[PDB]
């Protein structure tokens, strides 16, 4: 029994902290503000059953932003391949990646 | 009499004055004769990191003025 007294009386007791895309002090954006905004605007009013399957690309992008599991997997694959290449001497890291060139300001 | 306590108080005064002076002098020595820059906030740290790159010698204390441009 979700007695939604907040929506009835118009009070805002806890809906201000339910999402990171809501208003935050000094307009400090969330790390995944864009993805959550897209997911919420996609899945607004169509119901939970439709939102699960229809706005699934947006939710997948949001999850990837939140956890970076696939990005970390790609980076780990790159690191492993680079280590394997270095072991066999098939690759030489560039000087800007070896701390030899001054990074741009 | 009571002034006989003064030598010990003076020794303790010297022992407590050493830390402060030492810290200030070490900060000046390791920051090019200037106060060690504080980085209470990320903006100050970003300024410090940019200054380090601008210096070219990987030290933030050395500052490049109008002579560096053009």
């Amino acid at each position: 029994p979700f007695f939604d007294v907040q929506k009835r009386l118009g009070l805002d007791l806890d809906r201000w902290m339910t999402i990171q895309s809501a208003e935050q002090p000094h307009k400090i954006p969330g790390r995944c503000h864009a993805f959550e905004k897209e997911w919420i605007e996609c899945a607004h009013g169509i119901g939970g059953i439709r939102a699960e399957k229809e706005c699934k690309i947006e939710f997948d992008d949001f999850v990837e932003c939140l956890l970076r599991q696939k990005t970390m997997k790609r980076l780990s694959a790159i690191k492993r391949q680079r280590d394997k290449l270095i072991k066999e001497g098939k690759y030489t890291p560039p000087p800007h990646h070896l701390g030899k060139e001054d990074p741009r300001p | 009499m009571w002034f006989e306590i003064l030598p010990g108080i003076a020794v303790m005064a010297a022992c407590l004055f050493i830390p402060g002076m030492a810290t200030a002098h070490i900060h000046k020595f390791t920051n090019g004769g200037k106060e060690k820059r504080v980085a209470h906030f990320s903006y100050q740290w970003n300024l410090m990191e940019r200054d380090r790159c601008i210096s070219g010698v990987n030290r933030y204390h050395v500052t490049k003025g109008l002579e560096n441009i053009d």
Partner: peptide, 22 residues
């Protein structure tokens, strides 16, 4: 998905403002 388009090294070269924060 797709390939992230990235500008080339040449087209992001500017005469840097090589002054200090102070």
């Amino acid at each position: 998905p797709g390939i992230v388009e990235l500008p080339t090294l040449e087209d992001l070269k500017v005469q840097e403002v090589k002054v200090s924060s102070s």
